[PDB]
Amino acid sequence: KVDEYGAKDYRLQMPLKDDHTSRPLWVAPDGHIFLEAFSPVYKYAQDFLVAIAEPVCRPTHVHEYKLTAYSLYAAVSVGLQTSDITEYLRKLSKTGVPDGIMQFIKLCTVSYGKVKLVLKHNRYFVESCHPDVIQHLLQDPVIRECRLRNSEGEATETVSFEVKQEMIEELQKRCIHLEYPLLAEYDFRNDSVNPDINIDLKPTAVLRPYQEKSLRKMFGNGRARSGVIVLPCGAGKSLVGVTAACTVRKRCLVLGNSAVSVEQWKAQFKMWSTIDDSQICRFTSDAKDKPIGCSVAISTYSMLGHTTKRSWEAERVMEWLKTQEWGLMILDEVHTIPAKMFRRVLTIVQAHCKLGLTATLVREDDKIVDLNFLIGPKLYEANWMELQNNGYIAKVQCAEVWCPMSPEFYREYVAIKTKKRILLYTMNPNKFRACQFLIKFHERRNDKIIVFADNVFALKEYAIRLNKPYIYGPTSQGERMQILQNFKHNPKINTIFISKVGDTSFDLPEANVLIQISSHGGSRRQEAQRLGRVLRYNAFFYSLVSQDTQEMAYSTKRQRFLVDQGYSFKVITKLAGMEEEDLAFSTKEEQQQLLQKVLAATDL
Amino acid sequence: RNLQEFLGGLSPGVLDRLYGHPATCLAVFRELPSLAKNWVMRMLFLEQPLPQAAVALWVKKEFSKAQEESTGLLSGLRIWHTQLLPGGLQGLILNPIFRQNLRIALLGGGKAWSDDTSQLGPDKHARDVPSLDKYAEERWEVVLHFMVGSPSAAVSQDLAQLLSQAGLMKSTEPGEPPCITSAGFQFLLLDTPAQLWYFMLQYLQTAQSRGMDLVEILSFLFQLSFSTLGKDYSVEGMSDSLLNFLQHLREFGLVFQRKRKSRRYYPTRLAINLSSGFIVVETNYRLYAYTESELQIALIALFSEMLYRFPNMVVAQVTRESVQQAIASGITAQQIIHFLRTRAHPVMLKQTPVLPPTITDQIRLWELERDRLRFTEGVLYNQFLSQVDFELLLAHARELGVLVFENSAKRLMVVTPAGHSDVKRFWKRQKHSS
Amino acid sequence: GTSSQAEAARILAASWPQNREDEEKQKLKGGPKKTKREKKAAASHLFPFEKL
Amino acid sequence: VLKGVLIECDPAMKQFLLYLDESNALGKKFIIQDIDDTHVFVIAELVNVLQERVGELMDQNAFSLT
């Protein structure tokens, strides 16, 4: 509150430091939690805080968590009550809980189960234990359009009324503004209306304890609620979805991003669910394996939200699919859910539980907050540091090594400003030499290398120079598949180039070295995904940037997610044995010749 | 500077007189390298000088460099001296006074370093070790606050004069408080034992100004260094000037004494370490300090941005702007790294190294930002008609030692502004002789 | 050209972050290694291509 | 003869100053003589604006976390 040194000081607010340091926790007046990792009670405190708050940074020593309304909603969703959470927060405080946190917690936890949203007979209803809140929200003009025709009082038994199916998003957005959050609880134990299927996972797909925590938190008191589970791509993510689908024991719908992710999900189901191929169907207009009359259906976005004329078979399949309820609608790559057309996909189909899975929840345009009410609260957030400490995730040694700008390029870089400088620092001869040196060094030790590089125009001359396979991206379907298939089981070739194609969840084989050059502007999601393609010092990945250019600021601003995850980027300024062997662009003649071809774009 | 550097610059008589006290001999011995200590111990009971080759054959050929360094250090400290062995050989034997005093300090003999303690009986107003440590910390914090200039610290005028002579603060205008210079900031950033040692060295360099015996002060300081914590000693048996010096120690918190006329004085933990963690650093450029005194808070805020201040905790973030500002204030990155390492929390001591390499490398890179451009005022010469004429003028400039940059390819050279006049006269004189 | 290789190597190898690191190295490394564990820590934090 | 200040830096900053000379970003051609690939000779009466421009270039592509 005081700014003697520019720091928000709350020394007077929380003096309760009786005796003496045994509680490894610190609270903040507005809201924040600081945890000491080097404490004997570290595991218990972590288990308590994860269930009540989401983390904001997890370095090696002092973890920092944040208290939010949705975090408290998730906490009270589990069996934890207000008294228990308050008494345990006061138990481990070492400073005393400020009288600004108790009121906030009380306000958040009081209005949790007052209003519920239920789906029955393809009809959406809002049910309230306390009838007064119905009249309280009745005066809201936006809610009045949901009822049709005006939904007199829907006298049942508990006061409820119907709402418009296509406008469920608007009322969900308004309810949190009215401090009456809605909950999506599906009691799959006793339905007797749904034709529950005979899915049953084989008793040989063992799961790690960290997945056990997420699964247990999903099913707190015998019911499944919508939520988001964040696990690394190298870790077991699809396994959690398969286990959740098996436990729900209802008709499942899986949504992917790419047309190849549906094959990945089908393979996962065939591997860890023991379901016949007749029930499993993929709806992506490629094989048409009779999606009508199916137990589990797997499809992708951009097809359920078509704004144009749809295929006759696809139209009939969509008409069939929009006529029945769904149990545990699974979404993959949930981070890119809040889009113009992807959001309505949630409102275009009817489902009880919406389970979203992702590895990189970070996104620009601050639309992640919308995902809190679009699907649900952030359920589980895996601690990557302790995950790799167990040895089941590769300990990747992150590196941020920059190269100086050659004089033949820096004059043109500072001369041009009309967006034509993107290729200039991308095609830095020094960065080219560094990349070639790294490629040769890691090939000499037989390490699999994946080289990410945006700006496919630069990637052309970057890959043809070394005569190495590259994926332009619109090459074909077969060529990419065979290239990736022979990439892993071939000692002759062990390095490939990717142009923004590997920025999603694919079936790329295990790799130990990743070298990214000229990535997107500030996409923390892209860098996190690329880092996810390596883990599965077992491995290490490098990022090459050009000094005195916008790439420096871009790399600095796009690594703030991984440092919060706990990774540290060592800076490498010198490469050992740079002049030991011969590299490309050794002399100035070809370096200055590169200027003409890099300025030859002239895309005007 | 270390103790050996100061001792080596002293006259042989001063070194000989210093060895007359058993406490001084032990302090000198413990400063020696590991190889030197073995040689001293071996030659402890030798009444005859040894040949230089015989001593040289004890160490292997590969470690001859360390042997030469240790021998040179011993010769500079005058622990031993070369003796003209009969037959043209050179014999090496330790100083008899130093050897005798070291044996007395080790084996025993003579009287005790302190006069006595049981003559006056138990102390009526004795304190405890935590109380002595608290008093020393309070005195040191008061001194450091007076360095800043806050009115909360009031010290003697002689201390201000000593600080002015030390160069930390200068009194440009009489009457007004002195302004702390960049060297003052650098000293403030230094570690507490290092600050004590620097202050003592500055006192000793100016000790002759007050007409005080350097040997007596050094002997008393060394005796205090080996003193047992929590045990008092007799003031009596010392010259008056030393007593005055002791009073200054009472001002500095090294020695506790209830009254000026009291015959007892309690050495503190600071005095013990004069002869020679609470900060957690995270990979995300965050400092978590378990400190409460405003001194540590100010020191951390000098090179970092404060974020939170819990009653027993300080959460700060190390940013590029803060480090750049601290460097512009005159503090180097090496000093910051050493300060962080010294105050490092015991938990971080498990890590090898204690501080993560990324943070130190980032700090060093931020330090290199300031000196990206190098500036050298001078005069440029570009009117050389002949290469031979250019070569002669360049040789003359190099002889004068005023050359800054040379380019023989284009016959271009730069000289310092002071040396421009000499170069101009030389060039004019050569044309006159032509 | 023979001289082109040397000129390019001189320009690239020591352009920004060597003209001050080499000066510090020349003006430093006078005292011996404090402990052998510093070399172990350096080897553990160094990437494999910096060990050869 | 010419009187001024010799500036030594990396070739990148040297060519940045060369570009500033021709772009007239400071108002004149005060970058008079270039002597070496990494050294320049500039008049001393406006070193402050050059320092300000260099600092602006340096912290522009920095993304200070404050």
Tab-separated table of N, CA and C in Angstrom, chain B residues 341 350 352-353 357 365 367-372 374, chain C residues 16 19-21 23-24 30 32 34 37 41 44-45:
chain	number	residue	atom	x	y	z
B	341	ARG	N	26.462	-14.488	-3.393
B	341	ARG	CA	27.057	-15.748	-2.960
B	341	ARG	C	27.302	-15.760	-1.456
B	350	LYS	N	23.517	-26.555	-1.416
B	350	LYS	CA	23.556	-27.885	-2.015
B	350	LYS	C	23.861	-27.807	-3.506
B	352	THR	N	25.522	-26.908	-6.984
B	352	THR	CA	26.898	-26.676	-7.424
B	352	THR	C	26.890	-26.107	-8.834
B	353	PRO	N	27.156	-24.806	-9.026
B	353	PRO	CA	27.480	-23.831	-7.978
B	353	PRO	C	26.257	-23.385	-7.186
B	357	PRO	N	23.939	-20.690	-12.788
B	357	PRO	CA	24.798	-20.000	-13.763
B	357	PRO	C	24.055	-19.005	-14.633
B	365	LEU	N	26.248	-10.093	-18.497
B	365	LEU	CA	25.888	-9.532	-19.794
B	365	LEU	C	25.278	-8.146	-19.643
B	367	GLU	N	26.015	-6.090	-17.328
B	367	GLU	CA	27.138	-5.206	-17.035
B	367	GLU	C	27.853	-4.779	-18.311
B	368	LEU	N	28.022	-5.703	-19.257
B	368	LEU	CA	28.719	-5.397	-20.499
B	368	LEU	C	27.956	-4.421	-21.383
B	369	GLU	N	26.670	-4.189	-21.110
B	369	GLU	CA	25.897	-3.263	-21.931
B	369	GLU	C	26.439	-1.843	-21.833
B	370	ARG	N	26.828	-1.417	-20.630
B	370	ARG	CA	27.237	-0.029	-20.436
B	370	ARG	C	28.481	0.321	-21.242
B	371	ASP	N	29.470	-0.574	-21.285
B	371	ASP	CA	30.737	-0.299	-21.951
B	371	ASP	C	30.757	-0.773	-23.399
B	372	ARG	N	29.604	-0.790	-24.070
B	372	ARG	CA	29.559	-1.188	-25.473
B	372	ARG	C	30.356	-0.221	-26.343
B	374	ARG	N	33.328	2.658	-26.699
B	374	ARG	CA	34.570	3.125	-26.094
B	374	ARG	C	34.895	4.502	-26.655
C	16	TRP	N	30.612	-8.714	-31.462
C	16	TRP	CA	30.200	-8.021	-30.246
C	16	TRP	C	30.764	-8.631	-28.963
C	19	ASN	N	35.200	-8.920	-27.914
C	19	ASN	CA	36.163	-7.837	-27.787
C	19	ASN	C	36.281	-7.315	-26.363
C	20	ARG	N	35.379	-7.725	-25.478
C	20	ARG	CA	35.433	-7.396	-24.060
C	20	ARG	C	35.629	-8.613	-23.174
C	21	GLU	N	35.176	-9.790	-23.613
C	21	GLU	CA	35.437	-11.003	-22.850
C	21	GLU	C	36.899	-11.424	-22.961
C	23	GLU	N	39.406	-9.370	-23.497
C	23	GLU	CA	40.139	-8.403	-22.690
C	23	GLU	C	40.078	-8.745	-21.206
C	24	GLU	N	38.901	-9.129	-20.705
C	24	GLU	CA	38.793	-9.512	-19.301
C	24	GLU	C	39.590	-10.776	-19.007
C	30	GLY	N	44.930	-14.724	-13.011
C	30	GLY	CA	46.253	-14.620	-12.431
C	30	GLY	C	46.440	-15.567	-11.265
C	32	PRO	N	45.438	-19.045	-8.979
C	32	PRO	CA	45.107	-20.435	-9.305
C	32	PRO	C	43.644	-20.746	-9.013
C	34	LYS	N	40.480	-22.020	-7.246
C	34	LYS	CA	40.171	-22.092	-5.820
C	34	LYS	C	39.959	-23.536	-5.378
C	37	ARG	N	36.138	-28.485	-7.441
C	37	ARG	CA	34.702	-28.655	-7.612
C	37	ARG	C	34.102	-27.639	-8.575
C	41	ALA	N	31.441	-28.457	-11.512
C	41	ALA	CA	30.200	-27.722	-11.742
C	41	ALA	C	30.139	-27.186	-13.167
C	44	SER	N	29.340	-30.009	-15.467
C	44	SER	CA	27.944	-30.409	-15.353
C	44	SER	C	26.986	-29.417	-15.998
C	45	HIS	N	27.288	-28.118	-15.952
C	45	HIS	CA	26.426	-27.117	-16.570
C	45	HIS	C	26.771	-26.828	-18.024
